[PDB]
């Protein structure tokens, strides 16, 4: 397993930012497996929408080698 590829939008509700922020609104990122629960929890907390995540590196169902 060991890697997810995450595409999520994170809208802004607290403030309208003076900087562009179109670094951080729509993005695709590679996140390692043990990271994803906390990461997805974070994007959910700031109100973002998870558009897709994919397996890239490993194979599902592996018992070791993860």
């Amino acid at each position: 397993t060991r890697l997810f590829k995450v595409t999520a939008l994170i809208p802004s509700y607290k403030k309208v930012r003076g900087g562009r922020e179109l670094q951080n609104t729509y993005f695709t990122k590679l996140v390692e497996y043990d990271r994803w629960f906390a990461e997805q929890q974070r994007i959910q907390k700031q109100g973002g929408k998870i558009l897709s995540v994919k397996m890239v590196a490993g194979k599902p169902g592996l018992n070791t080698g993860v």
């Binding site: 994007i43 929408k49 998870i50 995540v53 397996m55």
Partner: protein
């Protein structure tokens, strides 16, 4: 997220109208259920561990292949992930029951869960069965009205995962 009151506020704001009689009736209806919801939330908080205990026991009794070698729940790691997921489902359905609205389930549970499980190869039908099992287990502990209220959010979760 948004609760029942905030849901009414949004549905009247997007149309730009003041609260009419129907909005006040909906708010009164939500306030009436508040004590029942708080009692049910307290009961589930007290017994969340046991609910997960016996719901996971029922799920792995009905599908023993899940926890045997070759199953998706076969390892201490993957069994731990399965029971963590069931615990999060119970706690978030409890949040939704308290709020009176399913927005928290969409924003913080179903937001990317379907296709995360698809990527991991998690069997969706067995997850639905586990959610149903937690539904009967919670209903037994919370009684009739609270069980109907929790069953609403449990069925919402089951539909979202399905």
């Amino acid at each position: 997220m948004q609760d029942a009151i905030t849901s009414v506020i949004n549905t009247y704001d997007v149309q730009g109208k003041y609260f009419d009689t129907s909005a006040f009736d909906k708010l009164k209806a939500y306030y009436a259920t508040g004590e029942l919801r708080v009692r049910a939330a307290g009961t589930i908080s007290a017994n969340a561990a046991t609910i997960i205990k016996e719901a996971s026991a029922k799920l792995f009794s009905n599908q023993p292949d899940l926890v045997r070698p070759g199953g998706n729940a076969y390892t201490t790691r993957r069994y731990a992930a399965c029971v963590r997921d069931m615990d999060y489902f119970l706690r978030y359905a409890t949040y939704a029951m308290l709020a009176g609205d399913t927005s928290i389930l969409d924003e913080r549970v179903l937001n990317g869960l379907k296709e995360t499980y698809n990527s991991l190869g998690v069997p969706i039908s067995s997850t639905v069965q586990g959610i149903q099992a937690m539904k009967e287990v919670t209903g037994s502990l919370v009684g009739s009205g609270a069980a109907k209220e929790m069953g609403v959010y449990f069925d919402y979760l089951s539909s979202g995962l399905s």
